[PDB]
Structures are given as C-alpha cells and as structure tokens.
C-alpha cells in the first residue's frame, strides 16, 4: 500500500515495476518448484492402498454414541443407524457425538472424520480483501478516531498498558448519527489496517423462516469467530434487529423477536466471551432495545455529527486530490456561505462539477462548475421549517 | 442548447495530458492483478487433511485385517422391540422410520436377554437379532450439564445483602440442613423467578451459586427448545425431566424464559403454535400428576410483565425475588469491589463518586471504573487520580443522561 | 414519556415543559451586554433586512423607563406583552412611591409575573429571556437577566441566543479584572465579542450604549464602522 | 444534438487549407498570408488550457493529413519563411494526427526544419502544444539514437539545448510539481549518459532557485533508493554538489555521501571528507557533520584532523573519537539511572514465578545446561553500566564449579557488563583474571576487547591480547586472543595489527576453529583493500579444505571473512575475483555464493535475485548440496533489508509461501533466519507467522532446527508484549521440547528482548536509511547457526558476543554548548510525504509529546517547535546542536 | 422507517435495509446502475435519498 506519489510520476512507474519483478519471480520459482521434482514414492504403499481401502464415493455420517470395541453406532441423514466398525487409522480422541464422520456404501464403515463442518452461509461473511484506503483517507474525525482505536487496535498491538491497571478493554461500540457521516468508512478503514480476521454482517442476514434457523446461525457465527483468530465482528444496521422488545399479536414477529433475544445471550450472558469484539451501527438510536445499550455489552457510544467550518475543508481537500483544479477557485466560498450538508454531499459536488467540465468541453474545473454543482446537489432537501416568530 | 459529445471529440481527451505514462502505468497495474490470480491457482495448496492417524501405528491393521474386516463384518442396524410370544421368538420389532417386521432370533443370542423395549442389532437380509445394546442416553442434556465452575464468590454480589438472603433459603439450605424444615413442619419452595432492570445482577447470582453448589447443576440453553420439526421441542422437555428424577436433587437453571413462551393467544388463527406445545409440556412436567420431588427451578427475565399467568402461579414459581438499585451503601461497596484490583491513588474517597451515580446499575459502575483508567492512558500515568474518575462520570452518565439540565442549570442552586 | 403538563413531575423530579421553554430561547438572535465604569453597553446581532420592509418595526432594544434598557430573545410575540406590562409597573411604582424605579425592582416584577404564569394549567409560559441593563440606582451600574422558569439573576457580562456558549466562554478569557476605562475601550470589547457572530458580516451589529446620565444613544453605522476599523488596526500586530 | 449553423471553423479552415494547394502555385500571397492567418489562429485556439477541444486541431486533419503529405514534401522548393509557417502550424497536431506509430515520425513535419524558437508560440501553455510531444521525442527517438550513437546528428546536437530550454520551462511557467518532471525528462533522455544531461541541468538548477531545490532534492534520493547499478552509480554523484554549489545546506554531506562512498569511489567521499575540511564555517554544522564520523557509520577518521589548527577546530577529533563517546556513556550513567534503572533488575528470571503453581507443584528442573542461561540474568541486563560487585557471585560460584565452556562464557559476560568503557574496564577484569586457567582467561581477555570496543584509542593495540596470543601452545589461548582485538578494532582499517595477526593464518598450526575465527577476526576489520588477506585465507583453504569433504567449520567461517573483506559494492568484479580464484570441487564451491552477494548488501539488483533462485532452486538433492541452497537462501536475506520496505513485503510474501510451504530442507531447517535478519522492530504479521511453524514444532526432524527458529524468533529488539508467546512456550518447553537441549535457548530468547530498557539500535539504518554496518558483526552469528553441535561447544564463543555494534538508542539530548537545554520535541509515526501540496505535513501521530531523552521506536522522525529553528542538518541523528533564533514577530 | 409497536411495519423495513446496503455496504459494487421512478418525493425515506 505504498503508491504515495499519487500522480503520474515515474516513481509510481518505477514502484509498480518492482512489484511486477517480485511476483513474476514468485511465479517462476514455484513454476520451478513443481518442475524439478524427481521424487516419486507416491505413499510408500501405505496411503495408496488406504485410498483404495476407502470407497471412492465417500459419504457423510453423524455419530450418535460410541461403543469403543472398534464397533460404534452412527446415524445417516434419514436416521438409518448402523452398527459399523472402525476400519483403522483414526485416533479415537477427536470424535464426539455431534462430530460428523466419513462412511462407505458397501459396508458403511468409518473411514475418516469430517473436519471444520461449516454451513456455507457464514463463510460468505468472511472478508478476504482490504477494500479501501487507511485512516488518511477520511477527512478529519480525529477525536472519534482515537476512541475506536482504544478498543480495537491498541489492545491487540500493545496490551502491556492494561495489565498495569488490570483493566479489560471495552468490547461493544455503537456508531450512531445522521446518515451520510462516515459510519461505513470507519469500519472499512479498520478492516484495512488490522491483523486479526474480519466478519461483516449485513442487517437482515441472520433471518430465516424455519422457526429455529434464525437463532441457530447466530451460534455458528460466534463459534467460527471464537475458533479462529482473536478477531472482531462487524454487524451493521442493527436497527432491524432491535426495537424495545414488546409483546404483540403476530406470530412471525416472535421468531424475529426470539433470534434477537438470544444474540443478547451469546454476547454477554453466561460462560465467558473470548477475544471477540463487536462493532454495531445505526442511524437512529432511541428506537433500540435498552437491554443491548447497557454496559457489559456495549461500552462506547459514539456520536457522528454533521461537520463544521474547519474539518469540512479537509473533506473538500481529499475529494479534490487527483483532479485538475484551476487556480480561480476558493474552497471557502461554498463552506462559509452555506452551513448545512454532509460528507457524502461533498463527494457528490466534486463528481458533479467534474461532469460540468465535460458538459462544456473542459478539463480544468472553475468556480462556475461549483456554482452550478452546489445548487444541483442540494435541491433534494425541503425548503424550510418555521417563519420569523423567533428573533 | 447543451450538447458536447461527438466521436471525433472523444479522441481529444485521451491524448491530452500525460500521453507518455497513461497506459504505461495502467497496464502494469492491470497485469499484476492478473498475476495476483495466476499465483493463486498455481499454488493450489488447500490441503484439508483429516481423519488420518499418525502413519506409524495403523500399519498392523491395514495389512490384512482391514481386508479381513470387509466381507465377514456386518452392516447390521439397531432397532427397538415391542414384545415377544411364548414357546417361539415371534418377535415384533419397529424402526420408527422404516416398517415394523416380525422376525426370528439368530444362533448367537441368549433367548433370555431379549426383553421388551431393548435396542438390538438386526441383520440386513433376514433381519435376525444378533447383539443387544445398552439403552440410549439423551445426547444434548449431556452437552448442557455444566461440569465446570465459573469463578464468582458471594463477595462480588455486593449491594444485595437481602436478595441473597432470600435466595440462600431456597437453594442452599435444604441441600445442607434438611432437618429444620421437617422438625418444624414446613416445606421449602421449589421455584424462584428473578426479575428487574437489566444489568442489575441477574446472571451474577446464577453464576455464583454454580460455584458453591456441591450438587447437579444444569444450564439450559433457551432456544434449543425451539426446533424446526413439529413436536421435537416437546420431546426435549421430557428427557430433561426424566434424568433429574434418577439422581437426587439436581438444579435446573433456565434463562430468558420470555423467549420460550410468554402469552397464549389465537385471533388470526395461527402463529407461534409449535412454541406453545413445548411451553405447555413444560407446565405439565412442572405441576400436575406425578409431582417431581427434588427438582429446583430457577428462572430469570428482564421483561416479567409479558409472561403467562400459568407460570405466575405459585406451585410452579414460588418466590419473586426482585433486584433494585443500590441506594448509597450498596454503591459505595460496589466501587470498592471493582476498583480494588487497579492502580489508584491510595487517598481517594468513593462516597463522592456514589453521589454522582443516582440511578445507576452495577454494570454502569464498573464501566466508570474501566473508563477512568483509560484516561490515564490518554495521558502518561500508571496510577489513577481523583479527576480521572470525575471525568469518567461525565463521560458515561452525563454524556447521555442530561444535556439541557447541565448548562442551563440555574433553577436549583 | 410523561411531560404534556406544567403541573406534573418526572420520576426524577423535573418539569420538562418548563425546560422546553428554554429551548425556544436558543432560536433567537444573540445579544450581549457588559457593565463598565460609567458607561453600560449592550449590542445585538443578526439584523438581516429583506430588501422590501421598513426596519423601525423590528427593534429588539427598548426602554422601560428613562434610565433602564431592555434586550431580549425568544419569540417576538411574547416579548411584546412583557415589555408593555413592564412599562406600566415602572410607571405605577413612581405614582405610589415618588422615587424613580431601581433596576432591581423591575426585574423582580418580570420574574414574579413569569412565576405565577407557570403554575396554573392552561397557561403556556413565556418562551423569552431578557437582559435588563440600567445604571439608575444612585449612580451604580448594574445588569441582570431573566429565565423562562422565572429566576432573576445578576451577571457582570452576559450572552444569550443561538450561540451563547461560545461567547460566554470567550468573555471569561477576555473580561479583564482591569476595569475597562476610557469607555470606547469598553465599547470595543463588545464589538470584539460580537465579532464572533453567526456570520460576522460587520454591518449586522446594532450596539446601544448609555452614559448613565443621558438617555439612550443608538449608534449609527458610521461611528460603529469606525470602531470596526480600529479592531482591524490592533489585528495587524499578529504578523 | 445541436450541430450546424455555427460551424465556422469546420468550414473556412476546412476550405482555405484545401485551397492551399489551389493557392500555393500561382498565388504567392495566398500561399503565405492564409498560412499566417491559419498559423496564429490555430495557435490562439490552443493557448487557453480551458478548451482542450480545439475547433481546428481535430477538424482540419481529416483532409489535412493527406494535405500535409502533399504540401510539405511535394512542394520541394521550400522557402526560408514558408517553412517557418508550415512547420510551426503543422507540427502542432501531429501527436493527434498520428496514432501510436507516431514514435518513429515526430520528425517528418518537425525536423524538416525546426522553426526558430518553438516555445515562442508554446510559452504559456503547459504541455498541450509540444511539451508532451517533446517527451515523446526523448522517449523513443533519442533513445534509439543514443543507444550506441549518442555523439550524432541534429537528433542530439540541437536536441541537447532543445531539452535544455524545455527543462528550464518546467520550472518557468507555473513552478508546480512539474519540477519533478525535469528528472522525468533528464533520466529518460540518455539513461546511461545521465550526467552528460545532468551537468547542464546541474548548472541550470544552480541558477534556477534556492527555495525550489529541496523537493527536487528529495526527489533524487527517492529515485536513488533503487536503480540499476550504473544509474545508482550516476545519479548519486549528481546528487552530491547540489547542496554544495546551489545551496549551502551542506550538513547533509557526511552521512548522505556515505551513500556515495562505496559506489563511485572511496577516495571521492574522502575528497568530500576534504570538502568537509574546506567548509569549516563556524562550529555548529561542523560539529554534527563530524559527530557521525566515529560511531554512526564508520570510524577510522582519526588521522586527518591533526593538521596545523590543533587548538579547538582540529581538537574536535579526539572529542569525536572518545569524549562524546564518553558523553554517550554519561547518557547511560546519568540519564538512564534517572529514567528507569537500578543496578540489578535481575528479575526476568523471577518473572518465572507463577509457573510453580501452574499444574500442582514445581522444582523439577535440574538441568545443568540451564546454568548456561543462568549467566544471562546477570549478562544481558547489565549492559550500559550494569556494574556488579558480588552480584556476579552466581557467576563466581559457577565459574569455579564446572562447565569449562561456561567458564569462558561467564568470563566473556564481564565485557558485556562493562561495555563502551575505557576508564576502569580493565581493572574490573584483573581481579577476576588471575585464576591461571585456560578457559577463564580466554573468556576474560576476549571480553577485554569487548570493553574497549568502539574506543580504538591507546588501550592495547598489541599490549594485552597480543601477549595473550603468544602464550599459545594449547587450547583457546590460541583461539580467544585474536577475536577480541579484531572486535575492538573492527571500526578501523589499520594495516599493522592485521599484519601482526596474519601469521595466525600463516602458522599452519592446524587448530581448525582458531583459523576459522581468524577469518572472522580479520573480516571485521577491513571491507576494502589488502588483497593479501584474500591470498592468505585461500592458501590454507586450498591446503586444508581440499584434503577433506567434511564439516562447515571449514565452510561457515573461512569464506565469510572473504565476504567481509569485500562487502558492499555492486561492481561484479569481486565475483570475477573470488569465484575464478577458488575454481574447485562443489563442496568448496559452496563459497561461490558467499563473496558473490556479500558485496551485494542492499540495492535493487533483481537480476541477481533471480540467479539467487534459478540455479539451485530445488532439484530434490539427495543430501549433497543442501548446505548451498541454504546459503543461497542466506544471501536472499540481505538485499531485502535496505530497499526500505518495498521488497520487505515481497520478501515475507515469497518466503512465507514458497519455502515453508512447498519446500523441504531449504524451508523447514533454515529459511526462518530471514525474519531473524530482515527486521528487529517487531510487528504481528511475522511475529505471529513464526509460531504457526513453532507451536507446530514438527518434531520428526532434529527439532533444534525448528528450535533454532525459536531462538532468533526473539531476534527482535525494542522490548514488547511478546512475553505472552515466549513464557507460554516456555511452559510447554520445560517438560516437552526437552530441557537437555534448549533450556538455555528459550530463556536466551526470553532474556534477549529485554536486553536493557534501551540500546536496541542494531538494525543497520541511520538517519533515514544508510547502513553504518553492524553487518560485519551480526552476520557471523546467522552464519554460525543453521545446524547443531555449536549449541554445546564451539558456538558459545559466538552466541554470547557475536553482534556488539549497538549505537546508543534515542535522539534526546541538546548539547547547546553547556549541555543544559532539553527543548520541546514532538514524537510521531514516520513520514509518508513524497509529493503533495506545498508545506507537506511531515507526520501523523501528534499524540505523543515529550521534552528530552525519550525513546526512538520503530518509525519515528521526531520534530520540534517553539521556534528554536533546529537548523542543524534537518535530518536528525541523535546529537542535534540546536541554536536559537526568533525573528518572526 | 416508522416506530415500533403494532404499527408501521417491520418486514417492509427489513427488505428496505437490504436495498439500502447491497449498493452501499462493506463491498462497493461496480458496473451496476439503478434507476428509480415514482411520484411523492417527500415521503420516501431520507437514507436512500442521500
Ligand atoms: N469525514 C469524511 N471524510 C471523507 N469522506 C466522507 C466523510 N464522511 C462521508 N464521506 C463520504 O461518504 C461515503 C461513505 O458514507 P457513510 O460511511 O457516511 O455511510 P453511512 O454513514 O453508513 O450512511 P447510512 O447511515 O445512510 O448507511 C464515502 O463515499 C465518503 O466519500
Ligand atoms: N450488585 C452488583 N455488585 C457488583 N457487580 C455488579 C452488580 N450488579 C452488576 N454488576 C456487574 O455488572 C455486570 C453485568 O451484570 P449482569 O449482566 O449479571 O446483569 P443481569 O441483570 O444479569 O443482566 P440481564 O438482565 O441483561 O441478564 C457484571 O459483570 C457485574 O460485574
Ligand atoms: Mg451505513
Ligand atoms: Mg443476565
């Protein structure tokens, strides 16, 4: 992530060709690795007959009980239960009733044991790519940047400060405020610069219709996060997962309400927790369940207000990084004159003014682009409130 | 009158300004992302190796014995027996998934141990009984017998000198002195509900009695009772209330019984039907015919208003212990619990801190104790001062509890 | 939850409908005021003329008696009743007792009239806050303030309106214990205080002073422009 | 689509150049005046860079391309003015008249005759007219000429001054970030004759500006971070005179032309050392120019400052040599007893207290080889004045109890207790010296070289350790005497005691470990000349190693001093020297990869890195040259630690996947010493990737291979929270991971991270990036261990006292004459700023704020404020001079 | 987004939050463009109008 000239300079032509040099050599070295292997023994006769000892259509079974005389009991998908033997090379130390095993068809015998057993709905929610830029991308939020770093990055990088006072770091963080402020960016910048793994949850993702399929996916969600790295979980749009827990008249409302009541249990209920951090985000905060807002579950409440006349300059500066800017413009024209508008408004102004230059056959962008752009973006919010009663 | 695109004017744009390094820098970034892919499929080293033992011990088995245990060994199934008839086998056997057969015993059996309701090994071809089995134990109650001590002493539940006193009477005292109840002529209650505001200490009292129990203690995961199949959740209730009768005096802790049934209604003709069958099965094995004897039930909830009056009846839930907020003497004891194990100044007072938390819980007090040390890491200190806690009270409570009353305060001094 | 009544209490002892009246004060234009050695001064901001009206009917600074002033915030309707009522009391006091009216006596009348106006149901309280400035009580300069709850109170430098928290924090680091003599210096303190306006256009400041012996002296936008020039003269020492 | 009606320019410049063949002949006025009316108007419709779409430039050539093909060549009688009207008007649209094979024909309109002063109609326009087109000429057209035919025709002759005025025009029009476009122009034009381009561009830059030097100045050194061998040879010496001739910032000479010492010429920086002795200005820049010249990148400068001004201007030499060294001892004496230091912590051993209740009882460990590691509770913590009377009684008993190699080891630990000392360091040894034993005196007198290491004053050039050496008829008296003095005089390149210790090589007394460390002792001294050392080593190498096919005591020690005597030059003559000198059998051609890449410390020479892979890649090699593929991988570890993190991410990407993944003996035995050589800072990417292969011990191999990778997994200094890994692996490492073999090792790894609170700079990067070695002192250890049997006997000479080039620690002191100032410094996560808007904010981590002797840390360019100007070198270096000036109200 | 209680609707919002997020979630999509057309400008929600 070092393309730091950020412009059409020969350095970025030199830097990226270095990256081309190392990856081509990494290709050619592993190309030589599968080339110059004169070693053949296959399996020195042991695993080769074993791979022929097991059946070729390997099937999947489920343990019920363990009769340890090398002759146990299993269960199929339909529930057909078979007094099968153990056909060796399996240590009887990691097989428990519930752990799924590997079976045959002709004799149904236990050949291996199936590992990791993840239902392929939670593996979709496992992020592999760092999407966007680092903390230097966003346009100045540094009082609240230092807040989220105290609970996520700093306890993982340097947990020597906390043992000197015996204080565990906070676990839950709410991001709340008006829309268009930077909630989704602050999660993506953390997921960029991190060392542990990352999990994203899009709102109504853990909602199904089979009346028990809802809460069952939540158990496997925290199970995967606990079994893997000391990592964090980002669950966004939790306004569709909690509203004050009232009792009413609809029957599909309860399997909604029950799944959202056992997330409470997995979070800060019994046993312990492990090193799992949870980051949650909404637009509205007052319509939530007060059982989730209490500390023990969430220890940080972070406001994201609409910007000022000072850090707004940093918003216009970053979104006008790589565009040909004519020297006629003043950034403080649109900032000081109008004092209402979000950070997502400013990105729309910079894109619209660039469209106005091609609209009148230009490359550079003058003040007259921003005069028409600041109009056209802002005409989507109504005229006003009250008349001059107050003075 | 605004139109500014024509195919000739397209060729104006992509030649003006850095014609030298435009594609020269771009396709270098393009084919390296292609090369990010072409490394990955060239590696291909996924390697989901499992099942295999260390390859230095099974060598004796997979020489001939594995081939000796293919054709002579049997793929026999297990079943259940209804009954038998005299002078003959005449064995009537079901599967509950397959059909019901009437079969013969084999030669390798003793005809005495073919008692009714017994799991037996059954042939696949002629379906003869070969091997009788030990009875089935339920697999998921074994998963939720705790077999583990969570470490919370009664000295950490401060502010609750009387709620523990009520809870000591029901759980601990008949299990250690079952004399004074009989020697006066009373009976102890058998069901205690816990209700009140959240974060008040519901889980702590349940976590602390799992420490000092000297008895069978069963945590019950609440949403395991709700299943996909019809009647499956009601069968899970039964296996729980059978094995409790086997051993003596086992403890069962439910938690958030708001989820497993709160109200019985039917106006739109449907809804939470399967939840009601599991919930009413819980009732009839709680009171009814065959009283349970020595089974103590603890429940805890945050929303006690929305529960069924069938559970509100004493005889099922007998003692209503509620948790409130500690007045002042409770909170001053709570600060001394959660801040004794941290590097503080040895001269500060805590009663001034308990003033400034008027309507607060035990969770909110601990959040102040954790936050005050976080201000010490904002600066460069290793001990907490008085103003560290005073800023932490404004950070936790006053940042969310009041914003109009603090600046415009001049109605009260 | 429970407010919707001026007679009910909260479970933690509050009157939210009284507290909501102070929220209506924060929609008003800011007005500041200090006292000095002899000359008291108060200024208002946010004139914002709209190209088609006469500006002598939008006045926010009035005089109750010959030696007491008034500046307010909130909404314009409720201020007109309080101003017109206070002119009667500061005149009927002179009839019953032949003295002139002190600046302390008229603020207790405004607070007590707003007091009983809060107690009875079906009486919406006044959503205004006022500044009473008068060097009347035997050559002594004073300034008080009010509150929609009905609590008269004395400061030495005051700010109200939309943005009072910045100005009141500004004056604490600016009001010297050195008394601002050479009273154009004290007037330049207010123009420096009102320089932190919501937009600071320069020509939206209406400062009104009183030399404690004459009547009210409304400043013109040529003398006030001279004081805005010398504020930029002292600002040249930053480089 | 509102076309039509206002298409004036697609009609009349569509007709009048179409009437130009209709009015060239038989119309002498219409040939000229309509051309001039075409020329100025097409010139005028391009000068505003606010209409890129030109109503002529992509409207006329639809017929005008076929016109110009019949107007410019086919006229054949071109006048003196009509060529200045044709070529001035028709060389403008030719980048867009023609497609991508324009690159051979930017001349068939232009270079018929370049009309006059082509910037006359191209001055105020940035690049739309011809300046992009000028770069198109220098890209392809000049390079094919200047590939072998630089000295050539008009394509070079006028093109020189044509590129001269264009390079002036980049810093003329707007003076924007197109300043850096001039090195984009100067290096593409005549890539190898860059200096022939730069010599005109040096003098043009000297008269260009004195404020717009510095961002182009750092643009050069960013391009000089990696190049070809000849480009790094060329543009670094072009970099030198710009703060010498244009400006006189000039305090960036000494270290930032140590950049240019080894590549261009060793005497050239000595002529720049002469240029140091020219600009003797005042004292303050002179002071900190010569602060680095002793113990920051090299020593050996104490012979050139005893000339005719020996009062104070040349009496800084001994002050540089040992007094500011002793003022640095006054840091560890005064300032570091003040911050966090009593004489004996001695309690990282005591931090193993909670283990005795973890699982019942304790007191089960009674291994005698743990008592080797018991010396490092006293040994490592007592660096920088951890002086101990009777706290060495754990040493004093175990010295007189058993363990002859530990008698040498505990005696060698006394030199680490008194490090950087000359005042009373020998007096501490003398009371613990006279025991009349072989092992006791050979460890103590080797430690005497450690005490005066970095001093190089008159302590014992041949006094003590030469008299220790001539005592030999026997064991380590023969060995341990030559090692300490070459360790002490490693910073020097003195010839005399090298010739005193050359008959150690010429004795042919066949003690093998003595001759091996003899190559290591002479290797630490010199890096340049004295080819007779290369002669002396290979004579005994051909005598001894030819009559054997055996252990790496031959191989790990004897070619290594050859590589240390020829370290750091990418000339590739040293490979022609060494590899053709030892043309031999392949077990002696193990040494082929040593002196090849020891001259290749750090640069971008990726063509070497592929021959560092492709020759001996895998081959599966049934136990014959497996040492060579490890040592070929050993030389992959360097040429990776200096490219300032550009290849470090690529190094951890390759060596994580390729070897430890799809390897064998190369990966699972040796390939973790990269991480024990790449960085010593620590970060949880590689710090957690090593216990992926360590918690999985993979015990089927001789597991001390993987437990060697345990050992220098803790080869990251600057103490951390890594105690969680080592103590928990020490808990499983007591019973399992047998305490007979590595109970020394895990606690060697445990006790080395908290060596001392401070003094962790062992990582070969000073100022920003220059080497300053540590290489000649470190690299023997990672060459020493990649096997076994030196965990018991022979490597105990090495494993204690191998690397001893720790150069202090932080950048807090002020030294303003009386040394009373402390100032206000502001420490931050390091710079990222390369080219952005004007005043580029230097850093980003504003939270930390100290005043005085605060730590260095991994990426810290610590700045200062409060208008103290800090006008010393403006590049840091931990002995700032800090004058005072405040003329800005 | 209306209130809770037995009013408004949850499930209409449950679908709406996914439309609110598959084009503006953690993963930004490319080369997919949406067109929305309706009257009643002031009564659609102020989270997809941003
Ligand atoms: N402080 C900021 N600096 C720079 N860019 C910003 C900032 N705030 C918002 N943006 C812009 O807003 C977009 C991100 O939207 P944001 O993270 O505000 O969504 P959100 O808060 O999740 O909105 P919603 O709550 O409606 O889903 C980015 O494209 C970014 O360019
Ligand atoms: N009376 C108390 N004394 C000391 N600590 C307390 C007390 N009450 C609560 N706490 C602290 O608050 C934390 C959270 O309390 P807990 O979650 O047990 O409350 P709860 O009533 O069980 O919450 P819920 O009703 O949501 O289940 C506990 O970890 C405990 O440390
Ligand atoms: Mg969002
Ligand atoms: Mg609880």
PDB file of N, CA, C and O and ligand atoms in Angstrom, chain A residues 183-185 234 236-237 281-283, chain E residues 20-21 24-25 50, ligand 3:
ATOM      1  N   UNK A 183     -19.972   6.386   8.901  1.00  0.00           N
ATOM      2  CA  UNK A 183     -20.063   5.153   9.678  1.00  0.00           C
ATOM      3  C   UNK A 183     -19.467   3.976   8.915  1.00  0.00           C
ATOM      4  O   UNK A 183     -18.659   3.216   9.459  1.00  0.00           O
ATOM      5  N   UNK A 184     -19.844   3.821   7.644  1.00  0.00           N
ATOM      6  CA  UNK A 184     -19.374   2.684   6.863  1.00  0.00           C
ATOM      7  C   UNK A 184     -17.893   2.818   6.520  1.00  0.00           C
ATOM      8  O   UNK A 184     -17.192   1.807   6.403  1.00  0.00           O
ATOM      9  N   UNK A 185     -17.394   4.051   6.394  1.00  0.00           N
ATOM     10  CA  UNK A 185     -15.970   4.259   6.133  1.00  0.00           C
ATOM     11  C   UNK A 185     -15.115   3.823   7.308  1.00  0.00           C
ATOM     12  O   UNK A 185     -14.038   3.244   7.118  1.00  0.00           O
ATOM     13  N   UNK A 234     -18.192  -7.244  12.718  1.00  0.00           N
ATOM     14  CA  UNK A 234     -18.903  -6.017  12.385  1.00  0.00           C
ATOM     15  C   UNK A 234     -20.305  -6.358  11.907  1.00  0.00           C
ATOM     16  O   UNK A 234     -20.473  -6.939  10.830  1.00  0.00           O
ATOM     17  N   UNK A 236     -23.682  -4.580  10.890  1.00  0.00           N
ATOM     18  CA  UNK A 236     -24.174  -3.267  10.528  1.00  0.00           C
ATOM     19  C   UNK A 236     -25.695  -3.289  10.391  1.00  0.00           C
ATOM     20  O   UNK A 236     -26.302  -4.327  10.115  1.00  0.00           O
ATOM     21  N   UNK A 237     -26.291  -2.108  10.565  1.00  0.00           N
ATOM     22  CA  UNK A 237     -27.736  -1.856  10.518  1.00  0.00           C
ATOM     23  C   UNK A 237     -28.484  -2.737  11.519  1.00  0.00           C
ATOM     24  O   UNK A 237     -29.276  -3.612  11.175  1.00  0.00           O
ATOM     25  N   UNK A 281     -23.801  -0.417  14.206  1.00  0.00           N
ATOM     26  CA  UNK A 281     -24.034   0.896  13.618  1.00  0.00           C
ATOM     27  C   UNK A 281     -25.474   1.049  13.155  1.00  0.00           C
ATOM     28  O   UNK A 281     -26.028   0.143  12.530  1.00  0.00           O
ATOM     29  N   UNK A 282     -26.072   2.199  13.474  1.00  0.00           N
ATOM     30  CA  UNK A 282     -27.395   2.598  13.007  1.00  0.00           C
ATOM     31  C   UNK A 282     -27.397   4.058  12.598  1.00  0.00           C
ATOM     32  O   UNK A 282     -26.390   4.762  12.682  1.00  0.00           O
ATOM     33  N   UNK A 283     -28.577   4.507  12.175  1.00  0.00           N
ATOM     34  CA  UNK A 283     -28.895   5.917  12.018  1.00  0.00           C
ATOM     35  C   UNK A 283     -29.666   6.455  13.215  1.00  0.00           C
ATOM     36  O   UNK A 283     -29.355   7.532  13.726  1.00  0.00           O
TER      37      UNK A 283
ATOM     38  N   UNK E  20     -30.821  -0.788   0.922  1.00  0.00           N
ATOM     39  CA  UNK E  20     -30.020   0.289   1.476  1.00  0.00           C
ATOM     40  C   UNK E  20     -28.551  -0.109   1.598  1.00  0.00           C
ATOM     41  O   UNK E  20     -27.697   0.749   1.842  1.00  0.00           O
ATOM     42  N   UNK E  21     -28.234  -1.393   1.414  1.00  0.00           N
ATOM     43  CA  UNK E  21     -26.916  -1.897   1.767  1.00  0.00           C
ATOM     44  C   UNK E  21     -26.218  -2.737   0.718  1.00  0.00           C
ATOM     45  O   UNK E  21     -25.001  -2.886   0.808  1.00  0.00           O
ATOM     46  N   UNK E  24     -24.450  -0.077  -0.976  1.00  0.00           N
ATOM     47  CA  UNK E  24     -23.651   0.826  -0.149  1.00  0.00           C
ATOM     48  C   UNK E  24     -23.141   0.135   1.120  1.00  0.00           C
ATOM     49  O   UNK E  24     -23.068   0.763   2.181  1.00  0.00           O
ATOM     50  N   UNK E  25     -22.816  -1.151   1.045  1.00  0.00           N
ATOM     51  CA  UNK E  25     -22.327  -1.841   2.223  1.00  0.00           C
ATOM     52  C   UNK E  25     -20.824  -1.806   2.375  1.00  0.00           C
ATOM     53  O   UNK E  25     -20.173  -0.831   1.994  1.00  0.00           O
ATOM     54  N   UNK E  50     -29.938  10.096   0.129  1.00  0.00           N
ATOM     55  CA  UNK E  50     -28.667  10.769   0.336  1.00  0.00           C
ATOM     56  C   UNK E  50     -27.773  10.585  -0.889  1.00  0.00           C
ATOM     57  O   UNK E  50     -27.800   9.533  -1.535  1.00  0.00           O
TER      58      UNK E  50
HETATM   59 MG1  LIG F   3     -24.244   2.620   6.669  1.00  0.00          MG
END
